[PDB]
Design a protein around this ligand. Structure first.
Ligand SMILES: Cc1ncsc1-c1ccc(CNC(=O)[C@@H]2C[C@@H](O)CN2C(=O)[C@@H](NC(=O)C2(F)CC2)C(C)(C)C)c(OCCc2ccc(CN3CCN(c4cc(-c5ccccc5O)nnc4N)CC3)cc2)c1
Lengths: 87, 117, 104, 149
């Protein structure tokens, strides 16, 4: 099982499965093991990693697909991170 | 030429009871879809198949203008309406089943209103 | 039944998954493969309570309802420092700004 | 049009089952491929409905018009009933992109007149203003069918 490290603007290190991080087109273009994000803070980058797990678990799935929840307080920053990351 | 006043009132009483009829359990007015024909622009496929289109609006107009000369002439146009809905929509559709109930409501209501006079 | 976790220590967060029937010891073997620290050098926690090696993740309270892909459960991790363990320490994430007047 | 219902006149019983947390708007494409809105389905509700062979359907969120899946795909067409067996249409959420899911949440909290008042990049104001539309998805689905031949 290969893993990659995604580092936020505030220095938090997120270790995620390589296959899950490739959900992002920007990360896919960069990888083709470590990635630093000088503009994405940890509360946003942790939420992005939860989306990667959600995407891999539920795409082409037969179990009920739950809603991906987004709190109103993080919505604007997460939108910009998703826009930048292409996911 | 005008019809006798007793004939025109019997026609209005039967059509009002069939129009106002509601289901015993749900209370839904079964005639609501049948009041007005869909427009020729809305549903031209209806007019391609149905040669003599008719709705409860045309039936009430035909009572007012004395086009029906008896309770049987009125019944013919109510059965035509219901048969048109059955032919267009076919078995298994709720509208097909509603038209079958309305044909039965017309006959029960007609027998009651004729026994009053 | 799969459970989705965030194994957290200082400023490190491992995103991983395991079965509800898998053990806490098997979860330390996953940490060992990533961070090269043996199981005997790890303490795993849930809500500040030390997890037993023989217990299943389901027995610890990690289920499909509490440990979801989109909302994973946190597992605290402390490593052994020389002969003693360090105190469990998880650095919090940053905070979003105040909600704008238009969103209220 | 490529995407339209056929006037088959062949009855077919269908079960619409809303297994999404959204209020569902069933959309029927008529014989000229024009989308027609049908009565809505609350979350978790199922309804046995009458349709016909070769009739084309799609499903959206009734409030926002976000796209939904039916039996894991975008379009649903019932064929004839084998021996009176109803055809099941399991309506669910798709796995939206993170970007589209963020746009949905921002549109639900901010009014259209207050989009340009937000502290975000201006390329997102046009994305927020480009609301999900059945007509735009029908073009994309038609272009996909023409490409596959
Ligand atoms: C409850 C619920 N929850 C969630 S979705 C839902 C639901 C689902 C299904 C239906 C009813 N079924 C349909 O409309 C099916 C679906 C699709 O296959 C197309 N179609 C058809 O019948 C077509 N029929 C055909 O292709 C054929 F018949 C040729 C085979 C059409 C649209 C009539 C051309 C429903 O229905 C309730 C909601 C609903 C649906 C549609 C409409 C608009 N209608 C259209 C025309 N209509 C009719 C009037 C008359 C008529 C009128 C006056 C006098 C004599 C008459 O015969 N006759 N036939 C009609 N179909 C009334 C208005 C209104 C309300 C509600």
């Amino acid at each position: 099982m290969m893993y990659v490290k995604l580092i936020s603007s505030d220095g938090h290190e997120f270790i995620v499965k390589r296959e899950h991080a490739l959900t992002s087109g920007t990360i896919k273009a960069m990888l083709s093991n470590e990635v630093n994000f000088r503009e994405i803070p940890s509360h946003v980058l942790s939420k992005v990693c939860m989306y990667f797990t959600y995407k891999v678990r539920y795409t082409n799935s037969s179990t009920e697909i739950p809603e991906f929840p987004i709190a109103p307080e993080i919505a604007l920053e997460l939108l910009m991170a998703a826009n930048f990351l292409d996911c | 030429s005008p019809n006798p006043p007793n004939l025109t009132k019997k026609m209005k009483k039967i059509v009002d009871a069939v129009i106002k009829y509601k289901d015993s359990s749900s209370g839904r007015q079964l005639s609501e879809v049948f009041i007005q024909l869909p427009s020729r622009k809305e549903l031209p496929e209806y007019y391609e198949l149905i040669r003599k289109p008719v709705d409860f609006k045309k039936i009430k107009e035909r009572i007012r203008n004395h086009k029906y000369r008896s309770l049987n002439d009125l019944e013919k146009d109510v059965m035509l309406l219901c048969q048109n809905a059955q032919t267009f929509n076919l078995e298994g559709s709720l509208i097909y089943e509603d038209s079958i109930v309305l044909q039965s409501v017309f006959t029960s209501v007609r027998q009651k209103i004729e026994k009053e006079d | 039944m799969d459970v989705f976790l965030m194994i957290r220590r200082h400023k490190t967060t491992i995103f991983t998954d395991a079965k509800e029937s898998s053990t806490v010891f098997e979860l330390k073997r996953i940490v060992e493969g990533i961070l090269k620290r043996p199981p005997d050098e790890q303490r795993l926690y849930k809500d500040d309570q030390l997890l037993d090696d023989g217990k299943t993740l389901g027995e610890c309270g990690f289920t499909s309802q509490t440990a979801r892909p989109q909302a994973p459960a946190t597992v605290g991790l402390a490593f052994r420092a020389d002969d003693t363990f360090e105190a469990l320490c998880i650095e919090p994430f940053s905070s979003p700004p105040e909600l704008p007047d238009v969103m209220k | 049009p490529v995407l339209r219902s056929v006037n088959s006149r062949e009855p077919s019983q269908v079960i619409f089952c809303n297994r999404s947390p959204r209020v569902v708007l069933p959309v029927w494409l008529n014989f000229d491929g024009e989308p027609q809105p049908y009565p809505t389905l609350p979350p978790g509700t199922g309804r046995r409905i009458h349709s016909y062979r070769g009739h084309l359907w799609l499903f959206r969120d009734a409030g926002t018009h976000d796209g939904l899946l039916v039996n894991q795909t975008e379009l649903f067409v019932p064929s004839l009933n084998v021996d009176g067996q109803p055809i099941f249409a399991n309506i669910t959420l798709p796995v939206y992109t993170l970007k589209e899911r963020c746009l949905q949440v921002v549109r639900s909290l901010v009014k259209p007149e207050n989009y340009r008042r937000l502290d975000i990049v201006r390329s997102l104001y046009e994305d927020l203003e480009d609301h999900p539309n059945v007509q735009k998805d029908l073009e994309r689905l038609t272009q996909e069918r023409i490409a596959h031949q």
